[PDB]
Amino acid sequence: STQREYVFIPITNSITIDVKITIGGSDHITNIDERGIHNVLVITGYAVDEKNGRLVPTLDPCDYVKGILVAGTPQQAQSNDFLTLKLPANKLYLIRKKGNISDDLKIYIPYSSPDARNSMKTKPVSISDDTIVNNIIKEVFDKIYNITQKEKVKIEKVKEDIKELFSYYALEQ
Amino acid sequence: STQREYVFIPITNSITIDVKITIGGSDHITNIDERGIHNVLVITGYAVDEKNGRLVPTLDPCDYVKGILVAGTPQQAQSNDFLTLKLPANKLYLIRKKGNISDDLKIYIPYSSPDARNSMKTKPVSISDDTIVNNIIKEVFDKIYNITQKEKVKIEKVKEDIKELFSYYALEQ
Amino acid sequence: STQREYVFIPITNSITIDVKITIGGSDHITNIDERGIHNVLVITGYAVDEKNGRLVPTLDPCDYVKGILVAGTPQQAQSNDFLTLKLPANKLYLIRKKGNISDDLKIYIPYSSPDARNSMKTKPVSISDDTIVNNIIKEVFDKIYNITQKEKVKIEKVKEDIKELFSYYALEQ
Amino acid sequence: STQREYVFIPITNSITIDVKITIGGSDHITNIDERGIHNVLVITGYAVDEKNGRLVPTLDPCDYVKGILVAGTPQQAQSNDFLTLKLPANKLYLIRKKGNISDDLKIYIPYSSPDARNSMKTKPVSISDDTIVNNIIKEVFDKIYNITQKEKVKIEKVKEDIKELFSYYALEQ
Amino acid sequence: EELLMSLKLKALYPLTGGYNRHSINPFYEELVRPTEIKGLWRWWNRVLFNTLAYSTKGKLYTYESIDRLFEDVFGSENKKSAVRLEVITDEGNDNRFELSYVELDKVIDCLRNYKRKVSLDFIDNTLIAEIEGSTKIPISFKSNLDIDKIIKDLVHNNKLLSFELLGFKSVEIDATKISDKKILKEILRDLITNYLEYFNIKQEVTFTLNIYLDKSREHKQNFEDKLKFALYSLLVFILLGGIGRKTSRGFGSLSIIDVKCYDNSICKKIEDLAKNFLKISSGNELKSKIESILDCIKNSCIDTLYIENNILSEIDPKKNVVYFINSDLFEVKRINDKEKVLANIYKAVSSEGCCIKSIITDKYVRKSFLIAFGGYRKVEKDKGLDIGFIKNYLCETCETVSSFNIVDFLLSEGSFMSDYILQYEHRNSLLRFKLISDNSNNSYLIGYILHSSYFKKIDIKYVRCILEKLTYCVI
């Protein structure tokens, strides 16, 4: 049926090898409708884990991360580490939400263990310094999205939108 | 080493035997003194698992459960299906917080599996049915805060607010 | 890339020989969508030279000419005396702007050697007396825009505008 | 902390060695910024003793000593003479206020026990005879405010109020 | 007669107004007006009092009756105020707006013998006087104040500022009839002053709000109680509102830099409550502090004493409209950059904003939400969108999906409240955004929704996280 996996967008390059399938489905949730990224998901309470980038659940309601989600299958020798769950497609805090949905979908989510060893001091961080936007537009978007140079040619739109929109919380340790 | 444990308030009978420890040290986060309940915790993003009462995660920030904090670790027969968390006493969303905190707390949330084979139709639930009300006034609140009818002869107050201060979202599955 | 040509509009019709591109491609700026004209370019600091119509570059900013700008090549025997250069489509001064372009524009402009012999005092010239304009909508607004007579029959919407939307300054020589 | 020295402004010259701090900090109450003096201070019920000038206390509400406020300790000659006091920065009758207050200050005022030996009658005094104005503009307004001659050439602008503003009372017996 | 309590305060991007509707004019600058502080304090006092009297007696009182009730501390035409406000700005000396020279006389030539609108735009770091008759000229001037090139693009990006700037941006000159260069020059000179004065926006204004109490107003009947409630409400005003224009969109947001109480028996219970804000580590900490100070009044504070006096007057729920705070709606976040937040409030509160478009769909509810919570909005009875849809969603009866139902909004029987929600131009926004700061760089964002008497059993459950998602998107 309908299955996708979420990826986040950190400052670090911990995204490269975490999946088997890049495309998966003829329809993605985050379509580039000539206006930038669309239907992006935000995850509340969760912070990134740049060293082995995943999502640790903080119960802080002010902590959050925002990333995209597309079809595929993330290295099936998993699920001891991923919070994979199905939901009726509406409990998602989907921002830039353009079109309608299927009212159900399964989704993989990266996840680091509880790790109750330290003081989980969190730190907010944004995506600036376009040099750190080139690596992602080549390694998160030029990887997952072939939209590059097939429909829209002024990539500058999605470039500024990814260097303005995605900002999250890191546990900085 | 001073931990705490989170306990919910459902409309089901899944509360009694969840922890062994009732004191641990000398203090508890949730409090009761002449005025109502203090430091009532709220964990957002999680629903209850009334059948085997635990916290089921979702992708909703609007999903939340209000409950209580005691001092202890669960029954010393767990740590295979619970969520530990060491937080610096700030990222906690208290309610009616009165006293100063330790800036180091270990919390234990009754965690559960997503059972990713059905649609998670979460439902808002209030606290009603004075049967279970009067039950939890003593079976969990006098098993912990026994003071009622010794000094807390004003149990109506605990009534007054548990009817309104608490509510949650569940799955009803 | 992008290549286009601009045609002024005087009170006369000496522009019987003009750009050849009729269909050509998929880009034309001075469109008419059932509301009159859109994206009329104003070349400021110039004056028209209707006798061999050529925008005479003055240095006074009050002087201006207003006319059509569309994709096409002048004659294949031009780029000698015309003014031609490229601009990123955000510098040209249009009016009734309905949309943007591909941020690139290389336009040929009817240009002249200013003829520094007779001191060029200008005069505002209007576009009235539809007795002229009635043929301009068959000699220009059909010689390129065969859209007429088949697609849109709100002709006065594109008549009374040109009666006031089109005016310029002329060196009177 | 912050301490201030009250340099009264008479037409006497006995005020040469009167500070143990020239500037020391970066905060003078009395200022000069291209308009004149600021925050001149008035203390009623006090008459100077210009024959070795010191603030002698009379109980008359119609006496007054006007002076400037600078920062620092008295001389290394203190603890017997000055009437030091700690005021919450609102007990100050500051003529020509320009800034705000530190909300508490230490003030030292060169004070003399009344010497109850004679009827301590007094007499008002105005600062005239620009000769003394000139010498005090060097004595204090170049020694404290070396900002003179760095930008301020309008000393006559200041000299104007020096001849007008710092009237006072003295026993003159 | 006696200094009651000082306050060091801070306001960010204040949009104060004067006679010329700007913070600066050819005569003085006034970034903070004590009259506005007094009037806003009174407004917040009335809101807080209705919150109190509604959280106990479920009643609501008219603003007249409340103002008559508190006229011993706030004064009226029958009594002089007991509290005296004194704002003191540091480096708030005598500046003004001087326009040394403007090089006109070339924009005038393209004007004469015509009827031309003259827009101005200030982008490109230079002033370019556009002409509707398709002509553009750049103007050279040298003025007293220096627009810092941050304010320029701030106004450029903030779609709210760039809107209310429409009213200081152009004139429609008519030079067909006799029109001499002197009066044209003066017209455009004053147009340019008006435009340039809009850009006196200085972030981070610091001022000291002193407050003096007249001890002559001894305990007449309930003076200490009225006064303590007034001070509670002044604190709530500093913590939920700002000063100036567009306070319901982030601007002017106040912050406490220091507090000093001088009459302990009165302000001792407020100076501590204010120290309770001189340092805020995390967001939920601040939300807790807010709910603490808010509930502290509803039950913990003095009592329901004068609420049992025969000076008050119940509202008429169909002809009167009051607001009052609802503690359930107090979303907080953390900023890390203020200008971007102030810019995105637009997407939050605009009917085609890509932060509420993605929180509400089918768009009618969307309109509805704004028309109920986002102040006045020009509605049109011309293109169907008014037909039924909003008319059905605000209707208090007649269906059960709209999480908001206006008390007296009737289908085709609209009597008063229709002519107020859809016709009254000066209606505040219930949905308000404030930007707070501690003495560190911890910038948060209180979102909250004022509760209005013209709602018929609002669904607090619904908007409580619609508002949460809104706060999520703008940050």
Side-chain angles (χ1 to χ4, degrees), chain A, chain B, chain C, chain D, chain E residues 1-142 144-215 217-475:
Chain A
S1 42
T2 44
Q3 304 89 346
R4 294 97 180 176
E5 52 186 71
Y6 165 93
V7 70
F8 63 115
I9 295 196
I11 66 175
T12 75
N13 191 359
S14 280
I15 308 91
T16 172
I17 298 144
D18 209 75
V19 60
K20 299 168 296 164
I21 299 187
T22 39
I23 295 313
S26 313
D27 270 10
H28 304 238
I29 215 65
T30 47
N31 319 297
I32 305 316
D33 311 72
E34 59 79 15
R35 275 195 279 139
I37 323 168
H38 279 231
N39 303 260
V40 188
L41 171 87
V42 198
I43 301 174
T44 187
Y46 292 13
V48 311
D49 306 277
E50 66 283 29
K51 38 159 68 59
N52 258 339
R54 285 182 167 164
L55 276 306
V56 53
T58 320
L59 276 299
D60 187 337
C62 90
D63 267 342
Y64 74 93
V65 295
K66 66 175 77 68
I68 51 184
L69 62 98
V70 286
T73 42
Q75 269 305 318
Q76 213 271 308
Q78 55 95 28
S79 281
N80 42 15
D81 50 335
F82 280 16
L83 315 182
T84 313
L85 166 62
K86 64 181 52 162
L87 276 157
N90 65 325
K91 268 72 194 177
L92 296 81
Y93 182 44
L94 208 48
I95 68 180
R96 301 281 198 184
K97 172 197 61 186
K98 177 189 197 67
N100 42 310
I101 55 174
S102 158
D103 301 65
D104 195 20
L105 70 88
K106 181 257 283 180
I107 176 180
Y108 309 90
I109 291 93
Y111 168 71
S112 308
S113 297
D115 316 323
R117 271 66 179 172
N118 53 84
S119 44
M120 281 218 309
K121 299 309 208 91
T122 323
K123 184 250 283 185
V125 71
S126 69
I127 305 313
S128 41
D129 183 36
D130 76 81
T131 320
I132 327 164
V133 169
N134 297 163
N135 46 28
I136 56 187
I137 187 66
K138 262 295 301 164
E139 296 311 309
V140 308
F141 273 160
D142 212 38
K143 284 220 325 182
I144 297 316
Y145 277 94
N146 201 351
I147 291 178
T148 61
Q149 288 89 19
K150 78 179 183 195
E151 199 269 319
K152 171 261 299 173
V153 189
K154 177 218 70 161
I155 311 93
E156 188 40 46
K157 202 167 204 173
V158 313
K159 296 203 286 281
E160 48 199 40
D161 296 334
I162 196 173
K163 76 186 176 54
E164 68 91 27
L165 194 150
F166 290 97
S167 290
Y168 60 90
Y169 268 97
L171 201 59
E172 63 93 19
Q173 282 147 348
Chain B
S1 45
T2 73
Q3 307 190 316
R4 301 283 181 270
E5 177 272 333
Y6 177 82
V7 50
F8 58 86
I9 292 90
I11 202 151
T12 77
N13 317 67
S14 41
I15 310 95
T16 301
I17 179 54
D18 283 312
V19 77
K20 148 77 175 63
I21 304 169
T22 183
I23 317 173
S26 276
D27 70 328
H28 282 216
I29 306 313
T30 310
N31 301 317
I32 181 67
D33 37 2
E34 277 91 47
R35 287 177 152 160
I37 309 150
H38 313 329
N39 306 270
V40 166
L41 203 65
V42 183
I43 48 182
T44 61
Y46 293 161
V48 313
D49 182 3
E50 60 272 12
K51 331 297 204 315
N52 177 27
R54 281 169 153 175
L55 276 301
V56 296
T58 184
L59 271 297
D60 209 332
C62 197
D63 213 20
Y64 70 104
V65 166
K66 318 173 151 302
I68 305 163
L69 293 204
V70 305
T73 178
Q75 85 158 329
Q76 310 88 26
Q78 289 279 350
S79 73
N80 293 126
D81 202 9
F82 281 170
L83 188 35
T84 182
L85 195 81
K86 200 175 304 176
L87 288 204
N90 296 343
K91 326 181 72 72
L92 280 297
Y93 175 52
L94 283 306
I95 275 183
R96 312 200 185 170
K97 162 186 167 37
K98 194 160 193 186
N100 37 5
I101 324 295
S102 277
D103 208 87
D104 62 71
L105 278 87
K106 289 203 69 182
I107 198 75
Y108 278 98
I109 308 106
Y111 183 82
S112 176
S113 63
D115 53 70
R117 282 140 289 158
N118 58 38
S119 89
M120 292 193 47
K121 290 307 298 172
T122 45
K123 295 274 188 305
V125 182
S126 159
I127 317 298
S128 292
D129 171 71
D130 181 52
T131 300
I132 197 181
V133 171
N134 273 7
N135 180 34
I136 56 188
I137 296 170
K138 320 180 307 174
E139 64 91 19
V140 75
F141 196 80
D142 266 324
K143 93 164 193 168
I144 294 314
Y145 320 98
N146 183 37
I147 304 172
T148 84
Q149 291 301 323
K150 277 79 68 189
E151 164 68 69
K152 297 295 108 179
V153 287
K154 58 174 74 68
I155 202 57
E156 60 279 15
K157 302 202 52 57
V158 180
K159 300 206 282 281
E160 292 148 22
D161 61 353
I162 63 156
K163 182 61 67 175
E164 272 208 80
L165 210 168
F166 283 107
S167 201
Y168 65 101
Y169 285 71
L171 274 303
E172 278 56 36
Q173 288 191 295
Chain C
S1 278
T2 80
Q3 302 282 167
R4 311 209 172 99
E5 207 280 334
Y6 170 93
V7 54
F8 56 109
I9 291 175
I11 59 188
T12 188
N13 260 320
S14 89
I15 313 94
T16 64
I17 172 175
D18 47 40
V19 288
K20 317 325 276 185
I21 295 315
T22 318
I23 51 171
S26 316
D27 49 282
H28 275 268
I29 308 315
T30 48
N31 47 32
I32 288 91
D33 215 8
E34 275 89 20
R35 287 170 201 179
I37 313 166
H38 312 267
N39 305 324
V40 168
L41 175 60
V42 175
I43 291 90
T44 42
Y46 281 61
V48 79
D49 196 14
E50 68 280 16
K51 298 186 280 195
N52 201 342
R54 286 164 161 198
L55 319 190
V56 180
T58 175
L59 278 301
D60 182 88
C62 323
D63 310 276
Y64 65 101
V65 300
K66 318 195 268 182
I68 293 195
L69 170 146
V70 281
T73 42
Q75 297 306 139
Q76 315 330 315
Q78 276 305 101
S79 89
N80 188 292
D81 293 329
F82 275 181
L83 188 59
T84 320
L85 60 95
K86 193 177 276 182
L87 300 148
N90 62 75
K91 307 178 53 60
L92 79 167
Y93 171 36
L94 301 175
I95 73 185
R96 279 97 168 105
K97 306 202 291 278
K98 53 171 298 179
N100 310 337
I101 316 305
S102 62
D103 281 337
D104 191 6
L105 180 74
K106 210 181 199 61
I107 49 174
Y108 308 74
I109 308 306
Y111 174 84
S112 77
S113 276
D115 195 29
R117 300 157 80 249
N118 315 114
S119 201
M120 301 177 288
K121 49 97 181 178
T122 174
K123 166 182 53 58
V125 197
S126 68
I127 295 308
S128 306
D129 320 308
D130 62 29
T131 79
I132 302 90
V133 174
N134 206 289
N135 72 30
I136 309 192
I137 46 185
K138 210 82 178 90
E139 291 151 10
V140 162
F141 303 99
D142 264 315
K143 268 210 56 172
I144 180 170
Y145 287 169
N146 291 116
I147 299 88
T148 322
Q149 272 91 19
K150 61 176 70 67
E151 183 206 287
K152 173 181 98 62
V153 285
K154 52 189 74 48
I155 181 71
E156 190 79 71
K157 191 49 160 300
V158 310
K159 285 184 57 68
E160 50 87 21
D161 55 357
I162 295 166
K163 292 180 177 67
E164 61 84 13
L165 185 147
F166 272 98
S167 162
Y168 49 86
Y169 269 44
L171 75 169
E172 310 206 42
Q173 294 102 28
Chain D
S1 43
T2 67
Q3 328 170 356
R4 314 294 178 162
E5 160 72 15
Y6 178 51
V7 196
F8 48 87
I9 310 299
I11 53 180
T12 203
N13 307 115
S14 88
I15 45 186
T16 320
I17 306 312
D18 279 22
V19 305
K20 203 176 180 179
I21 290 191
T22 83
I23 319 186
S26 157
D27 42 356
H28 275 306
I29 306 166
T30 309
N31 318 334
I32 293 93
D33 212 337
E34 288 181 350
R35 306 169 197 161
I37 314 176
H38 293 301
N39 304 269
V40 191
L41 172 133
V42 187
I43 307 172
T44 49
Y46 283 103
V48 290
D49 205 318
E50 83 285 358
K51 177 210 299 201
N52 194 280
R54 292 188 202 171
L55 304 194
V56 178
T58 84
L59 309 196
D60 177 55
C62 220
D63 312 330
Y64 57 95
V65 196
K66 317 191 188 183
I68 78 176
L69 273 179
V70 309
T73 76
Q75 188 189 353
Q76 179 53 299
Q78 55 263 355
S79 316
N80 284 269
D81 41 0
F82 291 22
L83 196 142
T84 184
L85 80 171
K86 166 157 286 179
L87 295 178
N90 62 8
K91 312 299 203 199
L92 301 184
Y93 194 17
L94 307 169
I95 279 184
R96 298 204 185 202
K97 292 192 179 189
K98 175 139 149 63
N100 294 15
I101 65 177
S102 197
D103 312 339
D104 191 59
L105 277 304
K106 264 190 279 184
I107 313 289
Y108 294 75
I109 46 185
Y111 166 88
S112 175
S113 185
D115 175 72
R117 206 214 46 77
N118 44 10
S119 189
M120 52 193 319
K121 75 185 54 60
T122 184
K123 167 181 296 189
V125 183
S126 179
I127 298 197
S128 60
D129 274 30
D130 45 37
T131 81
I132 171 70
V133 177
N134 279 77
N135 69 42
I136 213 65
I137 284 194
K138 329 291 177 309
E139 161 60 38
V140 310
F141 285 142
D142 275 291
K143 150 183 283 178
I144 292 93
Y145 292 103
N146 215 340
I147 294 90
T148 39
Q149 183 265 358
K150 299 226 288 184
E151 178 270 305
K152 185 41 63 188
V153 287
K154 277 186 282 290
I155 317 303
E156 55 183 345
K157 181 189 199 57
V158 163
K159 187 177 304 294
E160 214 165 39
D161 55 63
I162 312 302
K163 290 187 72 76
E164 212 189 41
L165 202 149
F166 298 78
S167 298
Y168 64 90
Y169 261 64
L171 290 89
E172 305 197 49
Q173 275 164 301
Chain E
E1 193 168 317
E2 191 252 330
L3 178 50
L4 183 51
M5 65 176 296
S6 175
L7 304 165
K8 279 203 60 57
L9 296 175
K10 181 255 172 181
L12 61 89
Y13 301 98
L15 288 179
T16 326
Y19 70 90
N20 53 334
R21 320 191 59 199
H22 305 134
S23 41
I24 206 169
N25 46 40
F27 306 93
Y28 47 80
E29 69 200 7
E30 199 180 34
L31 310 159
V32 168
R33 306 175 55 104
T35 75
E36 280 197 342
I37 288 177
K38 178 62 157 278
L40 278 164
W41 180 10
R42 285 170 75 110
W43 190 77
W44 279 102
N45 182 293
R46 290 194 299 261
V47 157
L48 196 67
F49 188 90
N50 261 347
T51 291
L52 172 69
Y54 171 93
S55 280
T56 84
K57 305 314 172 67
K59 311 293 285 308
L60 292 178
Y61 293 120
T62 72
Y63 286 157
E64 287 294 324
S65 41
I66 307 180
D67 279 331
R68 174 171 315 126
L69 173 69
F70 276 88
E71 69 153 52
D72 312 276
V73 292
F74 287 139
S76 169
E77 314 91 316
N78 288 114
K79 196 177 288 283
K80 185 198 205 169
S81 173
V83 287
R84 162 163 79 92
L85 300 202
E86 309 283 348
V87 165
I88 309 105
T89 310
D90 39 358
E91 292 168 350
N93 64 95
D94 59 354
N95 276 117
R96 64 174 164 275
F97 173 77
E98 296 185 347
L99 180 51
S100 183
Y101 71 84
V102 202
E103 312 287 4
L104 283 80
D105 315 277
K106 187 58 60 204
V107 278
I108 297 186
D109 323 310
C110 42
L111 273 171
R112 290 183 304 250
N113 319 272
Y114 276 131
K115 185 175 83 70
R116 307 303 190 70
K117 172 172 182 186
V118 179
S119 176
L120 268 67
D121 195 310
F122 191 55
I123 202 63
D124 319 280
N125 177 217
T126 59
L127 190 52
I128 177 168
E130 181 217 339
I131 294 90
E132 177 204 76
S134 297
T135 319
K136 312 198 68 172
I137 293 94
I139 324 298
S140 42
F141 61 83
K142 173 249 170 188
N144 187 272
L145 87 166
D146 295 325
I147 301 107
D148 212 27
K149 284 297 307 171
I150 283 89
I151 324 296
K152 295 183 184 66
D153 48 323
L154 172 136
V155 174
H156 209 81
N157 296 129
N158 198 336
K159 281 296 198 62
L160 283 196
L161 298 206
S162 58
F163 177 50
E164 59 153 40
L165 185 50
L166 267 49
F168 317 118
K169 207 185 54 73
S170 87
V171 284
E172 184 79 69
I173 285 191
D174 173 74
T176 56
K177 268 298 190 192
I178 43 187
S179 43
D180 176 75
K181 278 67 58 190
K182 209 169 155 59
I183 53 189
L184 273 75
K185 164 154 181 46
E186 271 327 299
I187 283 182
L188 303 147
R189 204 152 193 276
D190 217 39
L191 162 61
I192 286 168
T193 60
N194 284 125
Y195 192 74
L196 275 169
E197 285 167 322
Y198 188 91
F199 294 91
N200 201 50
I201 315 158
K202 302 168 165 26
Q203 75 186 359
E204 191 168 26
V205 174
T206 315
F207 58 96
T208 310
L209 165 59
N210 281 7
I211 294 184
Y212 305 78
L213 172 86
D214 188 11
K215 306 293 295 165
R217 310 280 156 102
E218 84 274 12
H219 195 154
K220 302 205 170 304
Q221 51 270 16
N222 308 266
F223 184 65
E224 291 83 3
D225 307 277
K226 285 175 172 317
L227 176 54
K228 265 181 306 207
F229 185 87
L231 296 184
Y232 297 147
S233 166
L234 167 78
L235 179 133
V236 187
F237 152 56
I238 301 172
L239 289 156
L240 278 185
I243 47 168
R245 207 178 53 251
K246 284 184 183 296
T247 42
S248 56
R249 298 289 170 256
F251 300 94
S253 316
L254 304 183
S255 176
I256 293 187
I257 284 182
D258 185 28
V259 174
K260 184 70 176 52
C261 160
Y262 297 91
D263 187 306
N264 293 69
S265 41
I266 312 175
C267 44
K268 77 193 313 304
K269 209 181 170 200
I270 293 94
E271 182 181 17
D272 50 343
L273 213 67
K275 297 309 185 64
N276 199 0
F277 288 88
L278 271 185
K279 194 44 73 177
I280 288 156
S281 58
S282 275
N284 296 106
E285 167 196 5
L286 167 62
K287 193 174 175 181
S288 61
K289 289 139 146 54
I290 294 157
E291 261 184 42
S292 157
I293 74 159
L294 189 147
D295 305 319
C296 179
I297 312 163
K298 280 179 309 192
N299 64 345
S300 303
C301 276
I302 305 106
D303 70 298
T304 306
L305 64 164
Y306 37 65
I307 309 172
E308 295 309 313
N309 205 344
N310 54 357
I311 213 65
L312 289 149
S313 165
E314 183 66 14
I315 80 171
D316 169 275
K318 294 146 53 62
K319 307 217 287 192
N320 285 20
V321 173
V322 309
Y323 301 160
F324 46 91
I325 309 170
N326 193 301
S327 201
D328 198 79
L329 293 307
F330 271 126
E331 290 44 35
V332 188
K333 296 282 143 58
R334 192 197 305 253
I335 303 285
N336 287 305
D337 174 31
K338 296 157 177 298
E339 296 90 346
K340 58 173 198 203
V341 170
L342 282 173
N344 291 117
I345 304 288
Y346 179 59
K347 293 170 180 174
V349 305
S350 168
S351 89
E352 303 277 347
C354 44
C355 282
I356 176 66
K357 186 71 64 67
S358 91
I359 292 185
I360 295 186
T361 52
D362 204 320
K363 99 202 168 177
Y364 286 129
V365 281
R366 207 161 65 238
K367 316 283 297 184
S368 317
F369 183 60
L370 308 175
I371 299 174
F373 295 82
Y376 176 73
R377 275 167 159 70
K378 199 64 204 309
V379 72
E380 274 76 20
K381 314 173 212 82
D382 311 76
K383 276 302 308 203
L385 195 140
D386 180 288
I387 292 197
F389 306 119
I390 53 150
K391 188 69 69 68
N392 292 129
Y393 285 173
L394 312 181
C395 159
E396 74 279 19
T397 65
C398 73
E399 68 88 18
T400 42
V401 78
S402 81
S403 288
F404 28 80
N405 309 132
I406 301 316
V407 158
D408 200 60
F409 199 66
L410 307 164
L411 263 291
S412 317
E413 327 185 12
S415 64
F416 180 81
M417 211 78 85
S418 47
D419 298 337
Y420 163 80
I421 301 281
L422 295 181
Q423 303 290 273
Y424 202 66
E425 303 92 339
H426 187 271
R427 171 158 62 92
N428 277 290
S429 203
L430 293 161
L431 157 74
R432 313 174 51 92
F433 295 87
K434 190 199 199 289
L435 275 68
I436 318 88
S437 311
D438 56 352
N439 296 145
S440 173
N441 218 58
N442 287 268
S443 318
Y444 307 97
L445 168 73
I446 289 166
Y448 64 106
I449 286 181
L450 286 184
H451 204 298
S452 92
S453 91
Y454 66 82
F455 277 123
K456 204 208 58 60
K457 297 294 183 295
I458 188 176
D459 183 298
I460 300 90
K461 184 181 41 193
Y462 188 64
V463 314
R464 186 212 46 81
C465 80
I466 302 312
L467 167 52
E468 261 298 345
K469 288 162 65 181
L470 273 177
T471 51
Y472 281 147
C473 193
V474 307
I475 204 164

